C-alpha cells in the first residue's frame, strides 16, 4: 500500500529540529489515504528525530492507574497520535526518537489495525535521576557521586538544583527539581539486583555541607555526619524521581488490533505502555532497558506494561524488561463500588482508588457481574447487560446524560439486579472487558517489585519466561476490592516452563485481598503450575489463597547456592482440590505445605514428595548416603522432620 | 502430739544469732519422736530467726529445671531439712526467717505427711538487686537511682561494687558483684506491669561517667550520653540478677502428702518451690511478694512453684504471686530420649536439656509410655512397666548398677517394647508420675512471663483465679520434646471462672511444639474453657494447637479500655484442632469475635450457638436495630461476617 514519508512533510533525519509538527502533517496525510481504503505506512528515513511537547497534539485524557481526577495533569501532550483511523503502520525503520520535557511518546485512540514498529524511545533529560555512589570516605566524610551526562544541574552551596532541557519555542525550562527527588530505589551495580529500601530517604542528600565538581561527571559531596546507610553506599545507584504519573508513556485507548513490535524503550516518562478499553494488543520484541551508550540504569519511570480493562488477546512475546520503578506487567480491570441503588435496574457506581477515575469502564451492550467485597465472590445469577451509561467519557465530557462526577458512573441494566446487591458491600466488574493473556518467551530482571500481575477470567498463559531477581513475588495474582480495586477473578491459568532465579520473595503468590475467607467457594479456579524451574534460597515457591482445582506438577526445585532456616516451600490458604504430582526437589529444601483456613483432605500429595503440615525436608535419595567422615548427619524422619544432628 | 521447741536447742528469737545448729538439733529430736509413732510439731517461739548457710545441712542433690549436671552447684545448703521421716509439722507461729548468702530455705526428702506453716521467708541481702530510676535529667545527663536499704555497696571511680552480708563464723562476704548483674527485667512502678525488655542490656549501667551518693538511699549516675532507653526510664525498677539457679528455693523430693500453708515468701534465692517425684503437695495461703516494709519489688529469683514429675494431687489455693523472674507455676514431667535400644526389653534414655538431669525419673514398678517427637503422639500400645533401673539416684550415687552418666538412665521393661520405637525419634514419659492439678482462688500479677504452665494427663482444674498483667500467655499448655523436653499430653483440662486483665499476650495459649501437625490424632484432648472473663485490648483470648474436644462456652469478653481495616488480632486461633464448640459467649461491641484457622477446616468448628465467625474478623457491631451515633462520629458499616464494608462520617 501507500507510503507516507515524514521527510516530505518537513522532518529530515538527524536535523536537530523539532519534528512534532511534521509528524502531525504526515499523520493527517496517512489518515486521508486510510479513509479511502488504503493500507498506509508512515516511514521515518533512518536517523534521530527530536519530538518536543510544545506543538505536539494535546488532549484531555483520564488514564487508568495514573493520576485519577487530578485537574493539574488532565491534559496530555502526545508525540505521535493516531486518532479515529485505521490500517496505519508507523515504521521508524530503525530510527531513534528522542522526546523532551514531560509527555506521552505515542498513542492510538479509537483506531483499528494500527502498528508501531522499529524505533527506539528515549528522553533528552530523563525524569529519573540515576546517581551512583562510586566511593565513600568516612574519614573525610565525603562521597564521590557519578552523575550521568544526560542530567543538567547547578550547584549552590550545599544544594544541587536539577533542570531539564529548555523549550526551543519559549526558552522555558520544562522541569526543575532540588537535591533529593521524592522517591528513590536502589540498584546494586555488583549484583544487578534492584530493590526498594526506605524510598523516602536518600542517603546521598542527608546532612550535606557542600558539593564540588570533580570533573569527568563526578561530584564530591561533603557531610557533617556519616550515616551507616551512606557508609555502605559504595557501588549503589540511587534512582530517584517524582511519583506523579502525569502522562502515560504510551496510550492505547478504545482501539482494536494494535501491534507494538521491535521498539527499544530506553526511557519512558510518567508511566508505561497503557492499554485501556482496547480489543487485542500484541507486544513483540520490545526491549525496556537503557542502552549501551548511557550510564543510566532506569528505563521506566514506573510500570512498563499496563493493560487496564482490555479484551481480546493481550500478547507479550520475545521481550525484555529491565529496571522499571514498578511492576513490569499488570493486566487487570477496575471494580467500581455500588454507591446508590436508583431502582431495580439502575445503579450509581464509583471509582474508589484515587489514581483510577474519569474514564468509561462500561459501554452499552457490555455485560457486568456483581461481587460481594468481603469474600470477593460473585453474586449468584448476577450477570446483566448494560442498556445505558451516564458518566465521564474520559476526555472531560459526558457519556449519556453524564453523572456530574469524574468518579461516578450511572448504569442502567437490562433486568432487575439481584435483590441482595446493596450499597458499599457490592462492587461491579465489566466482564466483557476481560482479556485472554499470553505472556511468553520474555526476560524479567532488575525489578524491585513483582514481575507479572494478571487478573482476568479468560485464558491466561504465562510460559517460558525467565524471572531473575524480582524483589517481590515473580507472579502475583490478586483480585482486590479493598485498596486497589483491581479486578478480576481467574478461571483458567497456566504457568508453564518458566525459570525463577534470585527470587526476593515467593516465586508465585496468589492473594486476592478478601478479608473473609470462604470455606465453601473460592475466588479463583482452575490453575495449573507445571514444568517450571524454581531456584530457591529460603522463600516459598507457591503461596496460594482461595484457589480451587490447583495443580502443581512436574516442576523442578533446585537450591540456588548448592532447626532448619527458611520457609516451607508451599502455603495454601482456603484452597480446594489441590494436587501435587511429579515434582523433583533438591536435597535439603523444605518440600512441605503450610495450611491456612483448610485441612489436609483438600490436598492430594500421593504422587509427590511434598508433605502436608510438616517441613518435608528432602533427604539424600536412596538407602545409602555417602557422607564425609568430617561432616555431621542430620537424621530425617518420614515427614521430613529432623530428629537428631550428630 | 509432742512439741519440740527450737528455743531448747540454743536458738534465741530476735537475737541475730545463727539458728541453723539449733534447728538441726530440734529436727533430730522431732525425728526420734516421729519414729516412736508420735505426731510432732517443731515450734518457733514467735520472732525473727536468722539462719546462716555455714553450719546448715549440706546435700548433694540434682534438681529439675536448675543446673542439671553442673558439678560447681551439686551441693546445696538447706536451712530446715526434714529427711527420712514422717508426721512432723514445722510451725513458725508467725516467725520471720531471714536466710543469708545463697542457700535453700527449707526442704523435705523421702518423708511422709510433713507440713511447713506460719512463717515468712526472706534473705538479709537478696540476690536480685532492684534499682528504681526515679528521675532523669537529659540536659545534665544524669539519672537519680533509688537503692533499697537492704543492699550493700561501695563506689569506686565510676563503678559500684555490690556485696552481701558476712559470715559470723569466718567474717567473709558470701558474694560480691559489680555494676550491672547479667540479667535485668522491668517493673513499671506507675502501672504495676513487669516485662522483659533487652534483658542483657541494663540502661542504668551504659556509658556511666560517675556515681555520686545523694543520701537517703539515692545515687546520682552521670553519663557521657543519654540513650533513648535511659531517657524514658523514669519510674522503672530495673530488677537485675545472675541467672544460675544454684539452689532450689524449697525442695520437696520423693515425699508423700506435703503441705505448705500460711507462708509469706518475701524473697526466695536461686529458684522457687520445687516438688520432685513427690506424691501430693498442697499449697494454701502462700503469698509470694515483697511486703510493704521494703523498697524492693522482686520476690523470686526465678519461678515460684515448680512441680516436676510429681503424682497424686497438686493443689495451689488461696495464694498470691507477685514479681518472679520466671513463670509463677509450672507443673510438668520430663521426656527422656531413647538413645540406645539394648534389647527388646532394655533401653537407655537421656536427659536432653542441660538444666534437668542427674536424678531418677523412673522407679521400679512405674509405668512408661513412648512418644514420637515429630507429631508428639503416643506410640500405640506402648505402655510398659519398669522392672529395673540403672542410673543416677539424685544425690551422686547409683540406682541398680548405675549408668556411668548423670544424663543417662537404663530401663528394663516388663515386655518387649513396640518395634517402631527407635533411637532419637522417640522419647519416654513416666506416666505414673503425672499429677492431678487443682489451682484455684489465687492472684497472679506483676509477672513478665506466663502465669501458669501445666502439662499432665490427669484431671486439671484452673478455677476462680485472677491474672492481671501477665507479660506472656496467662495460661500456657505445651508438651515439648523439641527444646525443653517437658511432658506431658493433657486429657482433662477445665479452665473456669478466671479473670484475665491487661494480658500481655494471648490469654490462653495451647501450643505443643510438634513440628509435624498430625491430620488424624491430636496431642491434647477434652479441654473446656467456661465462665471466664477476658478483658481484651488487641491480643487473642485463645490460641490453641492440636486439641480435640475443645469447648469455649459461657465466657465474657470485655474491651479493656471502653473509650475508643481494624487493629488487633482476631480473638481466636485454632491450629490442627478437632471437634471444637463455641457457645453462649458474650462479646463487647468492637472486639473481633473471629477465628483464624491453621491446619484444619471450618467443619471442625461448631459456632451455631455463638457469635464467633470462622475465617472472618467477626467484629461485633452495636447491638439492636437502631444505633445511636453522635453526629460528629463516623459510622463503620459491618457486614454479616463482621467485616467492615464502608467508613463514613456522613451517617
Ligand atoms: Na477496513
Provide CB contacts within 8 A for B607, sequence distance 6+: B582, B595, B613, B614
Distance A255 CA to ligand 1 centre (A): 14
Which set of grid coordinates corresponds to residue B352?
Answer: 536432653
The answer to whether residue A601 neighbours chain B at the CB level (below 8 Å) is yes
Strand locations in B374-435, DSSP E?
377-378, 384-392, 398-399, 408-413, 426-430
Distance A308 CA to ligand 1 centre (A): 26
Q: Which of B465, B445, B583, B616 is nearest to B532 (CA)?
A: B465
d(CA A189, CA A209): 27
d(CA A198, CA A182): 11
The answer to whether residue B619 neighbours chain A at the CB level (below 8 Å) is no
Q: What is the CATH number of domain B333-430?
A: 2.40.30
CA distance B515 to chain A (A): 6
d(CA A274, CA A279): 13
Spell out a b/e string for A5-26, using b for 16 or more CB atoms within 10 Å of the CB, else e: ebbebbbebeeeebbbbbbbeb
DSSP assignment of B303-370: -SEEEES-EEEEEEES-EEE--SS-SEEEEEE-EEEEEEEETTEEEEE--STTS-SS-S--TT-EEEE
d(CA A427, CA A177): 41
Distance A37 CA to ligand 1 centre (A): 6
**Nearest residue, CB atoms, A599 vs list B596, B599, B615:** B599
Between the two ends of chain B, the Cα-to-Cα distance in Å is 79
CA distance A124 to chain B (A): 44
d(CA A72, CA B624): 47
d(CA A529, CA A461): 10
DSSP assignment of A170-208: T--BS-EEESS-SEEEEEETTT--EE-SSTT--GGGSSE
Q: Which residues of A touch B599 (CB under 8 A)?
A: 595, 599-600, 613
Residues tagged in the binding site annotation of B: 245, 306, 326, 450, 486
DSSP assignment of A126-178: -SSEEEEEEEEETTTTEEEEE--TT-EEEEETTEEEEE--B-TTT--BS-EEE
Radius of gyration over every alpha carbon of chain A, rounded to an integer in angstroms: 27
3-class SS at B267?
coil
Distance of CA A151 to CAs A129, A244, A292, B230, Å? 7, 20, 17, 47
Burial of B559 (0-12, 13-18, 19+ CB in 10 A): middle
Distance A30 CA to ligand 1 centre (A): 14
Provide CB contacts within 8 A for A70, sequence distance 6+: none
d(CA A597, CA B574): 10
The answer to whether residue A521 neighbours chain B at the CB level (below 8 Å) is no
User: Domains of chain A: which residue ranges?
Assistant: 2-125+244-326, 129-241, 334-430, 436-645
Top-level CATH class of A334-430? mainly beta
> Are residues B267 and B123 in contact, defined by beta-carbon separation less than 8 angstroms?
yes
> Are residues B352 and B318 in contact, defined by beta-carbon separation less than 8 angstroms?
no
DSSP assignment of B451-497: SEEE--SS-EEEES-EEE--SS-SEEE--BSSSS-EE---S-EEEES
A245 annotated ligand-binding residue: yes
d(CA A460, CA A494): 6
**Nearest residue, CB atoms, A613 vs list B425, B517, B637:** B517
**Is omega for the bond preceding A488 within 30 degrees of 0, making it cis?**
yes
Q: Which residues of A touch B641 (CB under 8 A)?
A: 374-375, 516
Which set of grid coordinates corresponds to residue B648?
Answer: 463514613
Q: Which of A415, A412, A484, A416 is nearest to A453 (CA)?
A: A484
Distance B430 CA to ligand 1 centre (A): 88
> Are residues B417 and B441 in contact, defined by beta-carbon separation less than 8 angstroms?
no
**Nearest residue, CB atoms, A597 vs list B374, B597, B643:** B597
Q: Which residues of B touch A643 (CB under 8 A)?
A: 373-374, 424-425
Distance A1 CA to ligand 1 centre (A): 13
The answer to whether residue B8 neighbours chain A at the CB level (below 8 Å) is no
Q: Are strands A493-496 and A367-372 parallel, antiparallel or unpaired?
A: unpaired
Strand locations in A464-609, DSSP E?
466-470, 475-477, 486-487, 493-496, 499-501, 508-510, 524-530, 533-536, 542-545, 547-553, 556-559, 570-573, 576-581, 584-585, 592-596, 603-607
A608 annotated ligand-binding residue: no
3-class SS at A12?
coil
> Are residues A482 and A515 in contact, defined by beta-carbon separation less than 8 angstroms?
yes
d(CA A391, CA A404): 7
Provide CB contacts within 8 A for B240, sequence distance 6+: B128, B129, B130, B131, B180, B181, B182, B183, B184, B202
Residues just before a chain gap in chain B (C–N exceeding 2.5 Å) are: 564
d(CA A570, CA A614): 11
The answer to whether residue A340 neighbours chain B at the CB level (below 8 Å) is no
The answer to whether residue B599 neighbours chain A at the CB level (below 8 Å) is yes
Distance A42 CA to ligand 1 centre (A): 18
Which set of grid coordinates corresponds to residue B242?
Answer: 545472675
Domain at A2-125+244-326: CATH architecture = 3 Solenoid (2.160)
Sign of the CA dihedral with A161 first, then A165, A169, and A171 last = positive
Provide CB contacts within 8 A for B284, sequence distance 6+: B259, B260, B261, B262, B315, B317, B318, B319
Provide CB contacts within 8 A for A39, sequence distance 6+: A1, A2, A87, A89
> Are residues A478 and A455 in contact, defined by beta-carbon separation less than 8 angstroms?
yes
> Are residues A333 and A276 in contact, defined by beta-carbon separation less than 8 angstroms?
no
d(CA A268, CA A247): 10
Phi/psi class of residue A349: alpha, beta or left (left: φ > 0; alpha: ψ in -120 to 50)?
beta
The answer to whether residue B420 neighbours chain A at the CB level (below 8 Å) is no
Any idea what the Cα angle at residue B81 is, between residues B80 and B84, rounded to 5°?
160
Between the two ends of chain A, the Cα-to-Cα distance in Å is 79
d(CA B89, CA B82): 10
Q: Cβ contact (<8 Å) for A599 and B601?
A: yes
Any idea what the Cα angle at residue A389 is, between residues A387 and A392, rounded to 5°?
165
Q: What is the CATH number of domain B2-125+245-326?
A: 2.160.20
The answer to whether residue B516 neighbours chain A at the CB level (below 8 Å) is yes
Query: Whose grid coordinates read 477445665?
Result: B494
Query: Whose grid coordinates read 546435700?
Result: B59
Q: Which residue of A has its CA nearest to B602?
A: A519
d(CA A636, CA A638): 7
The answer to whether residue A227 neighbours chain B at the CB level (below 8 Å) is no
> Are residues B132 and B236 in contact, defined by beta-carbon separation less than 8 angstroms?
yes
3-class SS at B422?
coil
Q: Cβ contact (<8 Å) for A515 and B424?
A: no
> Are residues A479 and A356 in contact, defined by beta-carbon separation less than 8 angstroms?
no
The answer to whether residue B647 neighbours chain A at the CB level (below 8 Å) is no
Radius of gyration over every alpha carbon of chain B, rounded to an integer in angstroms: 27
Which set of grid coordinates corresponds to residue B141?
Answer: 545527663
The answer to whether residue A83 neighbours chain B at the CB level (below 8 Å) is no
> Are residues B604 and B576 in contact, defined by beta-carbon separation less than 8 angstroms?
no
What is the tally of helices (H) and strands (E) in chain A? 2, 58
Residues just before a chain gap in chain A (C–N exceeding 2.5 Å) are: 562
Which set of grid coordinates corresponds to residue B270?
Answer: 536461686
Phi/psi class of residue A358: alpha, beta or left (left: φ > 0; alpha: ψ in -120 to 50)?
left
Q: Are strands A86-99 and B384-392 parallel, antiparallel or unpaired?
A: unpaired
The answer to whether residue B227 neighbours chain A at the CB level (below 8 Å) is no
Distance A40 CA to ligand 1 centre (A): 12
Q: Which residue of B has its CA nearest to A352?
A: B646
Query: Whose grid coordinates read 510518567?
Result: A270
Burial of B32 (0-12, 13-18, 19+ CB in 10 A): middle
d(CA A479, CA A613): 27
**Nearest residue, CB atoms, B519 vs list A423, A594, A599:** A599
**What is the experimental resolution, given in Å to one decimal place?**
2.0
DSSP assignment of B511-531: ----SS--SS--SEEEEEEES
Provide CB contacts within 8 A for B482, sequence distance 6+: B373, B513, B514, B515
Q: Which of B307, B302, B305, B306 is nearest to B326 (CA)?
A: B302
**Nearest residue, CB atoms, A597 vs list B423, B615, B646:** B615
Q: Cβ contact (<8 Å) for B374 and A639?
A: yes
Provide CB contacts within 8 A for A388, sequence distance 6+: A364, A400, A410, A411, A412
Q: Which of A63, A498, A62 is nearest to A302 (CA)?
A: A63
d(CA A275, CA B455): 62
Count of CB pairs separated by less than 8 Å, A with B: 92
CA distance B282 to chain A (A): 38
Amino acid at each position: 500500500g501507500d507510503v507516507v514519508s515524514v521527510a516530505d512533510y518537513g522532518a529530515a533525519a538527524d536535523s536537530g529540529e523539532d519534528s512534532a509538527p511534521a509528524i502531525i502533517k504526515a499523520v493527517d496525510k496517512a489518515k486521508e489515504l486510510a479513509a479511502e481504503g488504503k493500507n498506509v505506512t508512515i516511514a521515518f528515513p533512518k536517523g534521530r528525530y527530536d519530538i518536543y511537547p510544545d506543538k505536539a497534539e494535546r488532549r484531555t485524557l483520564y488514564v487508568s492507574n495514573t493520576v485519577g481526577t487530578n485537574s493539574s495533569y488532565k491534559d496530555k501532550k502526545i508525540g505521535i497520535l493516531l486518532e479515529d483511523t485505521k490500517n496505519i503502520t508507523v515504521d521508524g525503520q530503525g530510527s531513534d526518537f528522542v522526546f523532551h520535557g514531560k509527555m506521552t511518546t505515542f498513542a492510538a485512540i479509537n483506531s483499528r489495525n494500527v502498528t508501531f514498529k522499529n524505533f527506539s524511545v528515549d528522553f533528552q533529560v530523563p525524569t529519573v535521576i540515576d546517581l551512583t555512589v562510586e566511593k565513600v570516605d568516612a574519614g573525610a566524610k565525603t562521597a564521590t557521586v557519578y552523575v550521568p551526562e544526560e542530567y543538567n544541574y547547578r550547584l549552590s552551596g550545599s544544594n544541587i538544583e536539577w533542570y531539564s532541557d529548555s523549550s526551543p519555542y519559549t526558552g522555558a525550562t520544562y522541569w526543575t527539581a532540588s537535591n533529593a527527588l521524592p522517591y528513590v530505589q536502589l540498584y546494586d551495580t555488583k549484583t544487578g539486583l534492584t530493590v526498594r529500601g526506605d524510598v523516602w530517604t536518600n542517603p546521598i542528600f542527608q546532612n550535606v555541607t557542600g558539593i564540588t565538581d570533580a570533573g569527568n561527571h563526578r561530584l564530591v559531596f561533603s557531610y557533617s555526619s556519616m550515616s551507616d546507610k551512606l557508609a555502605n553506599a559504595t557501588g549503589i545507584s540511587y534512582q530517584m524521581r517524582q511519583t506523579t504519573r502525569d502522562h502515560p508513556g504510551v496510550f492505547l485507548w478504545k482501539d482494536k488490533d494494535v501491534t507494538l513490535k521491535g521498539i527499544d524503550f530506553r526511557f519512558l516518562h510518567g508511566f508505561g505502555v497503557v492499554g485501556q478499553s482496547t480489543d487485542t494488543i500484541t507486544m513483540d520484541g520490545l526491549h525496556f532497558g537503557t542502552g549501551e551508550g548511557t550510564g543510566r540504569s532506569t528505563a521506566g519511570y514506573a510500570d512498563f506494561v499496563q493493560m487496564s480493562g482490555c479484551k481480546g488477546v493481550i500478547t507479550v512475546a520475545n521481550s525484555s524488561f529491565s529496571n522499571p520503578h514498578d511492576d513490569p506487567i499488570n493486566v487487570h480491570g477496575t471494580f467500581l463500588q455500588v454507591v446508590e441503588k436508583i431502582s431495580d435496574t439502575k445503579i450509581k457506581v464509583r471509582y474508589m482508588h484515587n489514581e483510577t477515575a474519569g474514564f468509561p469502564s462500561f459501554f452499552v451492550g457490555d455485560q457486568v457481574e456483581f461481587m460481594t467485597k468481603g469474600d470477593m465472590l460473585p453474586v449468584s445469577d448476577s450477570v446483566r447487560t448494560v442498556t445505558a451509561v451516564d458518566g465521564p467519557d474520559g476526555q472531560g465530557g459526558d457519556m449519556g446524560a453524564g453523572s456530574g462526577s469524574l468518579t461516578d458512573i450511572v448504569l442502567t441494566l437490562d433486568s432487575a439486579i439481584p435483590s441482595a446487591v446493596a450499597v458499599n458491600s457490592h462492587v461491579v466488574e465489566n466482564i466483557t472487558y476481560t482479556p485472554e493473556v499470553n505472556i511468553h518467551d520474555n526476560v524479567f530482571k532488575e525489578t524491585p517489585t513483582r514481575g507479572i500481575l494478571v487478573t482476568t477470567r479468560k485464558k491466561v498463559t504465562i510460559e517460558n519466561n525467565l524471572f531473575d531477581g524480582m524483589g517481590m513475588a515473580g507472579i502475583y495474582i490478586s483480585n482486590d476490592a479493598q485498596s486497589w480495586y483491581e479486578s478480576g477473578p481467574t478461571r483458567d491459568v497456566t504457568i508453564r516452563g518458566n525459570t525463577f532465579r534470585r527470587s526476593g520473595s515467593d516465586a508465585i503468590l496468589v492473594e486476592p485481598t478478601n478479608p473473609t475467607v470462604s470455606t465453601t467457594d473460592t475466588v479463583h479456579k482452575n490453575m495449573t503450575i507445571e514444568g517450571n524451574t524454581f531456584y530457591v534460597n529460603g522463600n516459598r515457591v507457591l503461596n496460594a489463597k482461595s484457589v480451587s482445582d490447583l495443580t502443581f506438577r512436574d516442576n523442578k526445585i533446585y537450591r540456588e547456592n548448592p532447626q532448619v532456616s527458611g520457609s516451607r516451600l508451599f502455603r495454601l490458604n482456603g484452597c480446594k482440590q489441590v494436587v501435587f504430582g511429579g515434582n523433583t526437589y533438591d536435597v535439603g529444601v523444605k518440600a512441605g505445605i503450610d495450611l491456612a483456613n483448610m485441612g489436609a483432605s483438600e490436598v492430594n500429595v500421593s504422587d509427590d514428595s511434598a508433605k502436608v503440615g510438616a517441613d518435608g525436608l528432602v533427604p539424600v535419595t536412596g538407602s545409602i548416603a555417602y557422607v564425609s567422615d568430617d561432616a555431621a548427619v542430620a537424621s530425617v524422619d518420614q515427614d521430613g522432620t529432623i530428629t537428631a544432628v550428630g
